[PDB]
Amino acid sequence: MRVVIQRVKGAILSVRKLEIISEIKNGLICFLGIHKNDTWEDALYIIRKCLNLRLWNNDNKTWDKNVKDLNYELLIVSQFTLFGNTKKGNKPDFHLAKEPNEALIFYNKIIDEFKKQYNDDKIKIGKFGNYMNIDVTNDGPVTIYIDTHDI
Amino acid sequence: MRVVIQRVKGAILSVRKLEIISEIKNGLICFLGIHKNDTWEDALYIIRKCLNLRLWNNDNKTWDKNVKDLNYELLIVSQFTLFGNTKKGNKPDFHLAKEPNEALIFYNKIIDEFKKQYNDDKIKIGKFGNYMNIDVTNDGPVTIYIDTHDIN
Ligand SMILES: NCC(=O)N[C@H]1[C@@H](O)[C@H](n2cnc3c(N)ncnc32)O[C@@H]1CO
Ligand SMILES: NCC(=O)N[C@H]1[C@@H](O)[C@H](n2cnc3c(N)ncnc32)O[C@@H]1CO
């Protein structure tokens, strides 16, 4: 499983009816990619990293507060393009991405778990399998990458 | 070298005078991280992929046009946080980043090479070593990740 985590001041997510369906204020936007062989343990790792990663400062020191400490939000967005393999040519190859129908069911379980480990109000999502327009205010910017297959 | 590429309809980047210092319309925002071990060839790989990756559709086929074909822009944003190591705990560790002063010089060369391979009016940047506020309209979204240390 792969994620790209960006720290934001706000993010506005729109799709065709454009029409807003999701917004957060301060927090994290997480672009989430599900590998065909991802397991539930891969998901858990991403969930707790997303929720406990210390991407904000204290007055005292840097990198010392996470999203929960600040009561901030998370906008989780499905991104199959993280498995866009560009090693062979300039046409990205998406072979490694779990196929959409299963990846949907897996995605919804992950969202369910994000909520259980934090709060229903705090987890926003996109619209899986649709075109999305996302207005983000990148705060830094801060951008973090995790691939669970590295452990 | 590490890069996160995102396809955008627009991006306004501002810093403390916060005033606007860079703006693009349709194109790519590239979050660019320099490893302490990167050589000029790491850079060349990244530049090539950024400029040539086919992240837009043609009328009759997907993943078939690059930023150049469409005459679109790129906003290049320096990002040491891409080496945020989180294997050990929940405090990210950034030791793999190239040291800032040398990194700026490297970064500046990369930007110039970007200007070379495309058009200096279509290449735009942020403010290395400074807090930046970037208003991005993500178009898709479409996010690509490349670590040169996985390749060659
Ligand atoms: N361009 C925006 C977009 O990525 N759209 C993707 C995802 O929202 C979703 N999707 C399908 N498979 C996956 C997967 N393995 N992981 C994450 N999302 C998936 O289905 C869309 C087209 O495949
Ligand atoms: N928060 C946004 C940010 O990351 N700002 C970084 C980069 O703009 C730049 N910088 C320093 N070292 C590097 C490096 N090794 N690679 C890329 N950029 C660097 O210096 C800022 C603080 O170190």
Author numbering:
A (entry chain A): 1 to 17, 27 to 160
B (entry chain B): 1 to 17, 27 to 161
Original authors' sentences:
We solved the co-crystal structure of PfDTD with Gly3AA at 2.1 Å resolution in P21 space group. It was intriguing to find that the electron density for the glycyl moiety was weaker when compared to that for adenine and ribose, indicating an inherent flexibility of glycine when it sits in the active site pocket. However, it is important to note that the carbonyl oxygen of glycine is rigidly fixed by a DTD fold-specific interaction with main chain N of Phe89 and by its interaction with Nε of Gln88. Thus, the flexibility in glycine was observed only for its α-NH2 group. In the second mutant, an alanine (EcDTD Ala102 and PfDTD Ala112) was replaced by a bulkier phenylalanine to sterically abrogate the binding of adenine in the pocket.
One key molecule in this process is an enzyme named D-aminoacyl-tRNA deacylase (DTD), which hydrolyses D-amino acids attached to tRNA molecules (a D-aminoacyl-tRNA). Here, we show that besides acting on D-aminoacyl-tRNA, DTD also efficiently hydrolyses the achiral glycine attached to tRNA—glycyl-tRNA(Gly)—as DTD’s active site pocket cannot discriminate between D-amino acids and glycine.
